[PDB]
Amino acid sequence: DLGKKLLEAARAGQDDEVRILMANGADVNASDHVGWTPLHLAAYFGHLEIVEVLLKNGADVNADDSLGVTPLHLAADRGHLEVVEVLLKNGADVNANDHNGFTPLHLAANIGHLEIVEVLLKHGADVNAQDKFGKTAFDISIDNGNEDLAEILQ
Amino acid sequence: NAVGTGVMGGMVTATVLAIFFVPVFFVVVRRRF
Amino acid sequence: GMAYLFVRLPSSFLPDEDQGVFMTMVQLPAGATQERTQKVLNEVTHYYLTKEKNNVESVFAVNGFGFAGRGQNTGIAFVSLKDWADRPGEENKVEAITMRATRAFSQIKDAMVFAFNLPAIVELGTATGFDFELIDQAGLGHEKLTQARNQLLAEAAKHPDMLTSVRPNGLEDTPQFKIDIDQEKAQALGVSINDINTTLGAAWGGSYVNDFIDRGRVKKVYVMSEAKYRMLPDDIGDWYVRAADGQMVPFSAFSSSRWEYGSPRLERYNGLPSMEILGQAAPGKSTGEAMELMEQLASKLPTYDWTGMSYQERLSGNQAPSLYAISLIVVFLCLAALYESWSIPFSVMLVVPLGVIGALLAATFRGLTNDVYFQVGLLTTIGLSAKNAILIVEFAK
Amino acid sequence: GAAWGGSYVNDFIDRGRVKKVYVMSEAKYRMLPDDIGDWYVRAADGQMVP
Amino acid sequence: GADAKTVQDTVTQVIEQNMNGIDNLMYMSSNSDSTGTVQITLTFESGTDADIAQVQVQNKLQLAMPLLPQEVQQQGVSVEKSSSSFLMVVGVINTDGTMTQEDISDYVAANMKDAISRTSGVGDVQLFGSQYAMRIWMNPNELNKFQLTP
Amino acid sequence: LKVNQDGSRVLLRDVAKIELGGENYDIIAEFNGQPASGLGIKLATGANALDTAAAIRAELAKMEPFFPSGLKIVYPYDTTPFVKISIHEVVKTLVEAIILVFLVMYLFLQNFRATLIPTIAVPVVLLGTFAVLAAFGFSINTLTMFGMVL
Amino acid sequence: DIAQVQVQNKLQLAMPLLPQEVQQQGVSVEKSSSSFLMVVGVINTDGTMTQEDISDYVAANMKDAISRTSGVGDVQLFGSQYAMRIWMNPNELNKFQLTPVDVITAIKAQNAQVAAGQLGGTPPVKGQQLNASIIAQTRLTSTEEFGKILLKVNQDGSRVLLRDVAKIELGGENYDIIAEFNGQPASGLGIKLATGANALDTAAAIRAELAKMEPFFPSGLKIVYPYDTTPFVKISIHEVVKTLVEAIIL
Amino acid sequence: GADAKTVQDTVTQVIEQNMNGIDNLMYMSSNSDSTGTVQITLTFESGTDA
């Protein structure tokens, strides 16, 4: 119940009514329905405060969801720097795989976001990441178009 | 009702009052002019 | 006492009447199936035909439709009532059935079901509500415009003394199952692209190939996968596409997928995207009031912000009573010529409040409104007491 | 006639609104008469022919 | 089968682009839902004549039709005029429990509808169902067995 | 679709389940727990609503005997009575009107002749009104009758 | 109104005898006059954007709204709304053994928005709880997206993409027209007055709908009125009114 | 290339059942050719706007 109230508030951005729901004892593993619990949503829009509030209260940072997408993925793709760093501070998997084989380093390459890639590399980097398609990091950097992104990966 | 209360009720007034107030209206307007 | 009672009487277009029918809503959570939304409707209709089987005639339960939006997660039920001779007392009038029938549908868990009398006149232009439209003036996009609404819809609640019942008409964004396929693998396997974008949107979406004739009538022939083969995402690894090496490839060897957020019901307006909003004015307040704030609150919206007010709200712009002035200019000019005086007209014209005060006392006893049957109900007591007067004046004169 | 002239192939989404998609050839390669024997087209046997 | 972007970007956007030079138009609503349907209400100045209104609109839709997908063109873009003013509805139900709404609708449609439309003193008539249709439900397993694709 | 090298043939029934089906399966309506299709009947231009409802009423009774087993029709939403009652009430108020004018006239006056002159002047004028509405296009509706009892 | 209804009616027969590539362009039936009512021009005081950029905003953000404004028969654009242009090189097409027909083919098949159905969709099975949509393959957006487009896979392992044979540049629909305000790069709209519509009321209308959409122009995007036949009507008419009052006092 | 009937059931019965409302309509007739063509004619109350 309130769990859903919370889900409807992680998504929207009403952090105020997230303190109130944290206050009364909502659920933080409410997940719906595709398996996206609130931590997943908060990252993807994305909201720092609620990612954090949630993290403090009880949040699986690594939650697969139906396809294995994990908050770290969602952040990289949507591409939020501030939220990639946090999910990394509270312990995440930078080598997290989709039922696809997409780690957070390919998804950051595709978006052409050189500022996220560097952090990810610093934290972790398999530059030999073999995709479902055997394409790798510097492989998708050429085909994509970006030039200097392939530099770092040589 | 909407056409029954604002009319039947409205009427009881516009007759009890008018038969007394209009002999007045006519006398006070012949005064100022 | 007339001026004081006039403005303290809420005014309205036309009383709902007891038409023997009332309608009810049913909304379900996003992702809800057609089957779940039907077990609720089952409950609704039993209630009317059991706990109140002295006043209800039949219930027409339409699963899968809605005035706000469509989809397997909505439903409307319409109720037909018995003759008024079989119902007595105002305890069995539609308002009494309704409030009492909405006040039993609250225990329900996971549904937002609420019965309500239907507007007389079938005017979606329900009264005293406004109709707000928030447009996308620059090439901003959806996630962008959807944000700027949650923002206007935040303030709107910060003034409960002004605005109540203010809400978005449309539907919230929901999760999607996006799916991309790679060409390089694709050409390297022999498989053609046309062979793919079609064995998907056909099996899964439905494709209407041709026509056939049945029982002397032309009809449509459609093609699709069996119910039990296009339900869940796993089921996508069951389809194969023939290559040119005359080999078959599984769909799950050139494709990838994940979850994305999209919107059903994307609205639009005058060419560019839109979110429609409707609300109403707080008790005591008017609408000339409840729309000015909405217009300003909105102006602070992040630039590509525009306000289009339409419908109930739009006609309201019209009209100023330049007629109430003409109307009154004339009534004077008329008496002026009957009595042959610029002055006497006034002794006849004074009687207006004597007719109106009895109108207002009469109304407030019961609880009635400033509807159209009233405004004409005045016009006729005004006209008649002014007639009495013209006679006494002219007999006196 | 696609090379000179041009050809409206599709539609695509440019910054919200939906817009067109042409195909033609670079001017240099279409300014002189001696430039017709500059173009080659594929044959079933696989060889380009001026 | 389409999403609401497919529908809006293509069918809906294009139509909107070509509805030019109509007369006495106050405003233009439109909403592209995910059930595959688009809906483009055009609201005219009062006193406008509906019959003419609707024909100028129908005219620009027509020239706009070569621009829409194959599968929308095949399907049909109807253009009705909106009222919500039903003199009644008639419930065609089945107490015997021997037939489905699928059937009831076909029946109403083929028999009741003509008579209802021709009914003396009646104007337009909606149908709250469809006609039967031919449906071929495939099995993804079978086709592959034969190196066949839909 | 294909012919076996083995030479056996692959026919469409073999890989799909061919049965008649509706065009759309999105919406499902019911009535007291049983399936119904319904029909929305709009009242055609310049038409009488009491007639058009008696019309279809007979026209529905008239096809009754051809209905399948269990198929019976009903009226989930009819507005006619609301138009029938309204009219009864206009004429009632005008009837008891004259009666009252007879007694509030006999009482003050003495003679029978005086009461009568009113009974004539009233129904004359009230009749003319209809004629002139008719001239301006106006219909006989909820608004224009109450506009008369007033 | 009716004169248009017929001439359209008779055109709608001739339509399917016209080449595929004349229908895709869209044939227009209008009921305007032949003379410009007014030319509403558009410059850029900042020069942040070129005369090509200028023409593509006008084209994609002002023209439809004006073309739907009641009273406006025809709107003629002095410039061309953009379009994804692609310029192919002969020496490079022969080098790789390709032909321009093939180029056209790869575009139709990678730049396509297709309908893919949805999950848990009607008719559901016995005991369904999930119900979503499916999405894939949306239109291309950036020239860059187009540059990727795969043309062929060499047995060598070489990647022949669209870029390697053409120069992709978002570009104008056509290069025939170039406008210039006072010797300064410009664009604009030639608006023609539909038949019988009041000129003044119509003009009041553009002005009103043009105003609704000034509050959103980019840097230095200015509107100008190089040609307007309307002001001479308004001033003329008030000049007679003046000699009326005038003659009464005299 | 079609017989007169195939048409009636795919063309003429289509159009005719869609013709429910029309101001001043007296009667309405409809012949199917078998030359594959067809025609439907609606006659209006005499004082009517063509």
Curated annotation (Swiss-Prot), chain E:
Induction: Positively regulated by MarA, Rob and SoxS transcriptional regulators (at protein level). Coiled coil: none annotated. It is found in: Cell inner membrane. It comes from the Bacteria. Disruption phenotype: Loss of susceptibility to contact-dependent growth inhibition (CDI); inhibiting cells still contact the target. Homotrimer, with large domains that extend into the periplasm, interacts with AcrA and TolC. AcrA may be required to stably link this protein and TolC. Interacts with AcrZ. Part of the AcrA-AcrB-AcrZ-TolC efflux pump. Belongs to the resistance-nodulation-cell division (RND) (TC 2.A.6) family. AcrA-AcrB-AcrZ-TolC is a drug efflux protein complex with broad substrate specificity that uses the proton motive force to export substrates. This is Multidrug efflux pump subunit AcrB. It comes from Escherichia coli (strain K12). The lineage of its organism: Bacteria, Pseudomonadati, Pseudomonadota, Gammaproteobacteria, Enterobacterales. The gene is acrB.
